[model samples]
Target: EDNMASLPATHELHIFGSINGVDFDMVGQGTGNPNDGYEELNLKSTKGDLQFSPWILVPHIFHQYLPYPDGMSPFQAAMVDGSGYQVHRTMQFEDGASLTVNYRYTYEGSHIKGEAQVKGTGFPADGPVMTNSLTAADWCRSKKTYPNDKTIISTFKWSYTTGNGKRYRSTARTTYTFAKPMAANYLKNQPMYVFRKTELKHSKTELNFKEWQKAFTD
Candidate 1:
């Protein structure tokens, strides 16, 4: 439960989705090494966009926005390594919405805690930042449901704004006991994009990009 290295030689995390009923794959690769923190590169045919949205913020589409001032380039989002947890970023979208994300995590024992906070504007200079918080027991914005038999994140919760000042809050966790296998079952009833966490457990050594993204093949 102490001292860890970095992940993401090139790819940070894998993303799979079912858009309009058709499935697709998007791999997250950092611009640099993982220890120093990876920066999100530009958009590609399938490289960007959802990395922070559906992939990272499931049941939540708080993607593409800016939460910081005009100069600082926040990461699109980031991931820890094996048994890893923690993701933070601030962004701005073309739609004029902006948001900043912060998460404090813990995989200690069987308890998962990834508390999160996201704040900013629904548009450029719309007003002050509106804050929404997800307690440590409420963060479900994760790449995987479990880090290990040991991964436990209790991250944040709700309310993402739109360019026209519309706001909608979503669901967060309540500290469940779903590490490892138990964790897969927990995701069973969730949005289908979240199930691969359990589906890919034993094929790490041979995880092809396409196979890695085959999230619904189970």
Candidate 2:
């Protein structure tokens, strides 16, 4: 008789938050597993309270995912890179922005190692800015049957500035641990929502709010 079993199973989760307000918008995206070569999770809100200074926007993107472990975490290898831009002819307000981040993480035997690169640029400006960071750690708890088992934690941070004497900075440390796998009953009875995608081929096309509303209703 064979008496062997697979070790701890790893998975990735993505999340986003968006807010809209009277004057501005904000968005945030995050991924628990940085080893996955996935796009950054993103959120957008138009509430002024949710908005950061235009100069701080790119820096915020860089700081968002700077802390991920390589050796002790579930990732075997990982990397991230991205860029951002400002839309509309506006200064001090980022009317438009873009970012592209990449990552890779894997688990080998009982160890994990990973790295990331991030690049971003925001508007009223017309250039590219770049930044990068690395992380590695050993799992402090690797048990397979507990909620807090398989924990890999690390610390990281970075800072940068734009032209015209504006400054920006942020920092945070994070720890990742495995939780009980999703129950089969929950997976069998999950709720579902329909989503629509609109494609535009021209750069100067206008957004019709009425059409958007109808699309959602239809």
Candidate 3:
């Protein structure tokens, strides 16, 4: 309780997961902001030129304000001091389908950080947390399935992409600014090829994603 007083909460939080390989690749994402009543989620899977369905939106109205204790409902207790990733659960269905979900309330490197929690639960599908269709909040809550199924164990680790993404750019406008020589030689020692206007839009946001990938890595 005392600790919660000093911690800062974030305005944004995001989580992502993807599966890939040979003919198909897919990803699902869920993210939210403290200021809004809703969170967005979506999934796209492609194989032989087709996509699959996986989309979600969580309501902030469904979540308790936070900084609660053991006497609360399972979902209420899941709230954290600042923010971070927490374990949800894994369930198996009689039809041979299985799901494993872990959650993060905040990123630690940022002001809030991953709290590392897996608040234990008695069960929700046992009641209340139920919704007609899977709600974003329901994504982590337990649900009842066929009788012949057993629970599976799993873990959730939070990670993010490193340097490969665009962190900087060296556009024709900025390229010449790297050093006096590179900029000075451009018009005189023309390269055989020039990047298309479209290439300028990529390599954004990632830490190492430099705007001048062609010059640096090339």
lDDT of each: 0.30, 0.25, 0.22
- The TM-score of predicted model 3 comes to 0.27
Candidate 1: what lDDT?
0.30
Model 1 poorest 10 in a row by lDDT: 195-204
Give all TM-scores, in the order shown: 0.30, 0.26, 0.27
Number of the top-ranking candidate, with lDDT as the measure? 1
Between 1 and 3, whose lDDT is larger?
Answer: 1
Q: How many backbone overlaps does candidate 2 show? A: 36
Q: Whole-model lDDT for model 2 versus the true structure?
A: 0.25
Worst 10 residues of 3 by lDDT: 170-179
Tens-place lDDT digits, model 1, residues 105-145: 44323222334454534432332122222111122233323
The sequence of per-residue lDDT tens digits that candidate 3 reaches over residues 149-213 is: 12112222211111333111110110001101112222232221211110111111211100110
Q: Is candidate 1 or candidate 3 better by TM-score?
A: 1
